[PDB]
Design a binder for these strands. Structure first.
Ligand SMILES: [Mg+2]
Ligand SMILES: [Mg+2]
Lengths: 107, 282, 287, 107, 282, 287
DNA sequence: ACCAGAACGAGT
DNA sequence: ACTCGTTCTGGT
DNA sequence: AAACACCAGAACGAGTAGTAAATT
DNA sequence: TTTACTACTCGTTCTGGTGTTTCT
């Protein structure tokens, strides 16, 4: 389990410049990228081969614009990540849980 | 998939952008469909769309529907799960008794062998010796129901000698809760592997899975064991841990979903043609 | 029960007082779960509660689902009790080759008869005579692709020198889609009848999942070619609306006019009975 | 040598909300945070005690607003950082160089 | 600081937000002032403001100004570098000869000892034996200039026997380039440590640093050695590597800046009071 | 050379044809590097080329720098050749205690007489007589803090019952800043004269980095007290502008009116000569 | 997929 | 500041 | 019920201009 | 030659709204 962060800035001045930002964001959300912050999106990849496969998929689905940057961190650092002000995302998709209860944990 | 999703509260489950959307009045959640492995809808308040069901069955998520007592009662089997489906069915008709007998004797050997280890953990050396008399003194096609006798000996070592599996207790209900979860697992794996769950290697809709699962039956008789004293909710909760915990298979520690998927694919390899070995789990 | 409920519009199905509630824009209908033999969900728009699914299995009803292409995808399978349509899969496997050969000979005979009759209605007298000459006496289990030559003659008379899959005009822009628009009917009926589309009569090819569906749709094929031929010169985007007249228009079956949905349901049931060696006459669709 | 990335999201609706964003950005640039991207800033820390000292300094100079998040990466991952489209910052401040020639390298 | 900054081209160096700003018509750059350690302004085209100089001297960067031949000619000496500066000056007056003699004999021992290892690397065993006759046969206050004789022997092993350090060529020019860079380092460290560079432990503005630097003199005679053949630009470029490379001191490998700062701080401990040991560099 | 150059305004100093170019808004002046003995940069606004610094060491000129508070911070140190002011540091160390004792006795004598005379000008006759009686005969190297009592009397007559550093009014909002506004002058002059401010005459305290600066400024402190006393009732913001009359106003020294910059420069030079045991009369500042 | 080596972090 | 243990990545 | 399309809005974010001050 | 305001300006950016469409 390692996290991947995809920081991007992409220009919004022409129709074709905004017609590929929307496509990029649709692809990002479609493949399961949790919005850490505005333009900072993260995915929890369970093994390294998943990271290689999705790096290939991102390269194949490049908007070919702006500045799209990938950082791959171990889950240790994504869990040691410090929030000065704000709260962590508590959603199920943001955790490495294998048993997940959309409801009442029986405890 | 790797996540296991258990929905116990009133909600509406829907689809959006390759995500399962859970919308309770308190919360809205999105889980990527590739991550989910089991969708266990225990409560009768879930209002799920049919468009979600389509994407769930293309992604081969094991959707299980329960009843008012939160006991499994149904699950979804995809009609078309493999590209080679027609070929595997046509070959399944051509499953001669000579390979079926060897496959079932191997699988029953694995079941009794894995039964012996629990007796070793249950501090029953003489009961393990009886299980070994049934195991080394193995039966082909069970002429004397030696598998049933070994199961009875293992239970007598496991539960009280008066206790019977058919009788209704808290233990005897969780021991079937887990069996139904595992049966759904193996039915999903058989139907994905292109075979028919309704055929049997030794009719009934789950005859194929009910035999391939047998070596993994002691996985359920140990979780119930270690928590047999407490009420049904507790044995249910610890039975849920099969999805979460890790078990040793082959030469590596893997989660029970992967062991189920790999085991349910090697048996089909040998049944299709006598060029494979039935794998052993322990 | 007897009623097979076909939910093919945006709906919400729920359960109150032993009654399937099928709510939509038109009518929030009342249906009793005692009468419902087979619930068939035909779209992705439908919304169903888990409570309804709980009490659809209690009454032992077959809950069949469909995907975006209106094709069967998954039937809700109960652990404890099972429908009366779950025994055909165990006898479909044991179907004898003789019944398959006879019923395939009859189905292919109907296909050639329909194509030849429509050629007689397509202003090709010599071509109609030749199409019937391909099956003047239906070749009993023809080993070669004589049906290939019959299709060549029929499609040559219908759409010109070539009507193969290669040409990108409405010759395939309509026939491809229509031939998939009726494959859904036969696949859905076959799975409704408790049969497996994957293995079918004379379906030596394992490359097609919808074996029995196509094999039993073979007689019903010429409707699509007729509707295409009438509106052939129009664009494909026009044929997307023209081809939908199948559901609205009623065709003659069993001596009376019926919607093609009822016709395909009856034809599928009768063929399935025939392959079970019940002795019923293999159903006929011709005009 | 490890890098620190400080992704921040801070509201701009009131004067006090914008009077602490400007102060935060002035502090960020003052302590040597290279603008990786819009609101994504990075610093190269030579040892771990520097990381602890600057974490304490950031906690002492918190704007107490928005969502400010610190991720600490080893320099290996910040150098394995993948740019789908765009170019790396080639400035001297972004490198772990010890001999630096603002001019002509004698090679 | 850790970076070493060498400005060789026309530019304007200015201050903004704790940063050194370098602006040529080609480029604009910002370097955080805490990162810089040496600002080596080789070219006479740099146009640097005086506000930058103030922040540079508060942050104690070793700003070195060179001449037309890119040879160092000046550097900045902070008047007030230590809060305890006045007390170190007043104590520096109270530097009796008894502790100065011991510290200088220790430092000269370190210089000759470090000279011996280079002869070991120079494949001169007999020259190393002469250096050892000077080393083990050590001198107190150099009655016979045994330090100079040992330096002459090391040079004769190092350069040709006819060659002299005072003579002029490429080697005896880079050997002084490096000596001036190191002298700036040790002058900065002495003035930061609160002492006076103009005093001497055994007048002239760099007498204190010119003795404390002595054990690190062979750091410069080895870089010049390994590249003695090529032209002056090459030996200058490899001399720049003292800032970049790593040298073993105490029990760890540290860059020469840390060795210079560390060494120049225990010598002052012993001169201030006879309660410290002169550290050995090797 | 003889000229010392005090660059105090926003300027740009460069080098062309053996000439220091000192460009500003007023006059892009021409100065010859041959005449320049000591270049003194007084502010942080100045821009200097590296070429000029190259030709400032070549002619052996002391290039002194100043920080935001106009206080000496760093002198450009040449490797090869050195200024004629680099020998005082090594003779400042060897300064004998006797010369320091005499100079401090005269320095505090001038301070006490200045305060007493200004009290005579401050309409406190009895207080002026008492301040004079604190040093009616200047106590030769007084061990106790009798100067503390003299300062107590002077400040009691000046600013009321208490004029200590605790009070937050313009008594310290002006005197403290003004006493730092003339500390800059004496520190800069002492470092210009080739002396070290860090060690000073009778400067037993090691917490004072500006030892000699303060010790020689002691006679020159009273001007600040006069200026604040005249404008005491006004706010400190006003005193920030009032105190700047030090530079503009000319005071009597050596028998003639001069700007206080020239006065402090000459006073520092003469005190340094006296500390050198040259035999010169320790300079006098009193009105 | 497993094992070994290297690097990083924490503790004494 | 040093050393050991744990984890991550690379290679066979 | 969901995907696809763009349009529009309200919020996030950096840079540039201009004025003021510049020895506690 | 710096830092210290607030101002405004143009670019980045996510969400909401309305229309359209659907078994090749
Ligand atoms: Mg961004
Ligand atoms: Mg942001």
């Amino acid at each position: 389990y390692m996290r991947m962060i995809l920081m991007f800035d992409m220009p919004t001045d022409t129709a074709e410049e905004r017609k590929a930002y929307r496509k990029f964001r649709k692809f990002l959300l479609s493949e399961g990228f949790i919005m850490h912050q505005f333009s900072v999106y993260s995915k929890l990849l369970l093994n390294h081969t998943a990271n290689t496969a999705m790096v290939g998929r991102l390269k194949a689905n490049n908007p070919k614009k702006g500045n799209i940057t990938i950082l791959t961190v171990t889950e240790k650092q994504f869990a040691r990540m410090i929030y000065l002000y704000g709260d962590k995302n508590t959603s199920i998709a943001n955790s490495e849980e294998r048993l997940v209860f959309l409801g009442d944990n029986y405890c | 998939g790797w996540r296991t999703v258990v929905v116990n509260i009133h909600s509406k489950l829907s689809y959006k952008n390759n995500h399962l959307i859970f919308r309770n009045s308190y919360k809205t959640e999105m889980i990527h469909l590739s991550e989910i492995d089991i969708l266990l809808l225990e409560t009768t308040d879930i209002v799920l769309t049919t468009m979600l069901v389509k994407r769930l069955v293309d992604e081969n998520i094991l959707v299980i529907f329960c009843d008012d007592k939160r006991l499994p009662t149904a699950f979804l089997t995809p009609y078309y799960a493999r590209h080679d489906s027609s070929l595997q069915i046509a070959r399944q008709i051509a499953w001669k008794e000579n390979v079926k007998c060897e496959v079932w004797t191997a699988i029953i050997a694995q079941k009794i062998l894995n039964q012996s280890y629990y007796l070793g953990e249950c501090s029953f050396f003489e009961k393990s010796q009886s299980i070994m008399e049934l195991y080394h003194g193995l039966e082909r096609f069970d002429p004397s129901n030696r598998e049933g006798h070994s199961a009875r000996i293992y239970f007598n070592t496991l539960f009280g000698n008066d206790f019977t599996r058919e009788s209704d207790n808290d233990i005897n209900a969780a021991l079937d809760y887990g069996y139904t979860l595992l049966l759904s697992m193996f039915a999903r794996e058989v139907v994905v592997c292109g075979c028919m769950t309704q055929i049997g290697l030794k009719f009934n809709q789950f005859n194929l899975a009910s035999d391939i699962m047998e070596p993994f039956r002691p996985i359920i008789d140990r979780i119930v064991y270690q928590n047999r004293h407490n009420n049904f909710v507790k044995i249910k909760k610890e039975l849920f841990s099969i999805f979460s915990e890790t078990y040793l298979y082959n030469g590596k520690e893997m989660y029970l979903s992967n062991i189920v998927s790999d085991y349910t694919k090697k048996v089909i390899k040998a049944l299709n043609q006598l060029g494979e070995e039935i794998p052993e789990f322990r």
